[PDB]
Subunit: 118 residues, 4 copies
């Protein structure tokens, strides 16, 4: 299922628990960027997905602050769980750093992460 420990192509670690209320909770450890150790995450997922083989929609957020470090930024991942012999979560993400109004144009990075339980 969705619950468990996941890894992306960057080697970052995504540990998540999916509740029946549609809630996501857990921790995220980034391999790259201004991050150290684990950060809190929370999100949502569709608790009653379709049955036509479609994926299960979900999303979550990490604010890159912990007791170790503060990168003044947040990332949201938006994607879906796909079932199969090899289960994976495909996402696209938006990473926004706090900026002055003059610098807002360079506030937001975009990318794509594919997660697996390897």
């Amino acid at each position: 299922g969705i619950t468990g420990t996941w890894y992306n192509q960057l080697g970052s670690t995504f540990i998540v628990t999916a509740g029946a209320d549609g809630a996501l909770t857990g921790t995220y450890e980034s391999a790259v960027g201004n991050a150290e150790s684990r950060y809190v995450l929370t999100g949502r997922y569709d608790s009653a997905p379709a049955t036509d083989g479609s994926g299960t929609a979900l999303g979550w957020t990490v604010a890159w602050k912990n007791n170790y470090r503060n990168a003044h930024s947040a990332t949201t991942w938006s994607g879906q769980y796909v079932g199969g012999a090899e289960a994976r979560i495909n996402t696209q993400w938006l990473l926004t750093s706090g900026t002055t109004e003059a610098n807002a144009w360079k506030s937001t990075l975009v990318g794509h992460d594919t997660f697996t339980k390897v």
Copy 2:
């Protein structure tokens, strides 16, 4: 405190949110049409210790478009920053992903931008 409250977008969407000292965002998102039928759980995070150099406050949240009235089999995430002022604002970009077949994954994700203003 600054983030905590009710906010509205231009298209008519509203949300109410509470920002905890632990960096948690929790509340409810309501779509353009004002009814209970269009109220959904909102959950996210924020920088509880933003910089002091004039920068905005980074944040993000998620709404899965399922409630006790309906299920659209999708979710939206907003990633942006809070900008304080006499008229405070939250400037975001968002990603809406719907459940799809692997074959239709390429058309699974919409992207847009929303600016919210505080009541």
Copy 3:
């Protein structure tokens, strides 16, 4: 005709463009500071036969940030639509990719939005 002309964004960026009957966009993009040093080639495409139902006109263009004065080793693409009116507008979202190492590819692409208005 409607697209053909000079356009300006809020941050001060301007571009001049010509729309050919073949669906080609060609012109020059100038960054916020008004000098020759900041003028770059613009190239793109557009729907020369848009729908008649009130929809906007789909378009897109690219600027590689290299000219005879400087090279930032990057490129931006704008994808949006033209909206005719007394005050015509082009509403876009854009992607700016810089050349990176495979290791830094994850931080290679910025995303944003710009609305241009016609002079």
Copy 4:
């Protein structure tokens, strides 16, 4: 080099010619969506890239109109050429359809395409 015939994970075909003026020209054939046969493309690329092993930045546009069909939309790809034993062009793209102002919120799809010469 960049010039040549390329294919993405969707099986779509990307035939491109890179000029020394920084210009891109060619044709694109989509495997998916409201497309038939070939459509014109044009774009730009950095003609004098760095030497530190960094990729070469580029972008291009396709308006989904030809003599066969009109999908009232346009796609722009933004990414970079990466050199190696297996050369590829990694992109992210924005696909905007013409819409009413009320429907602009659902005007723009986003995704990622990886191209190779296979």
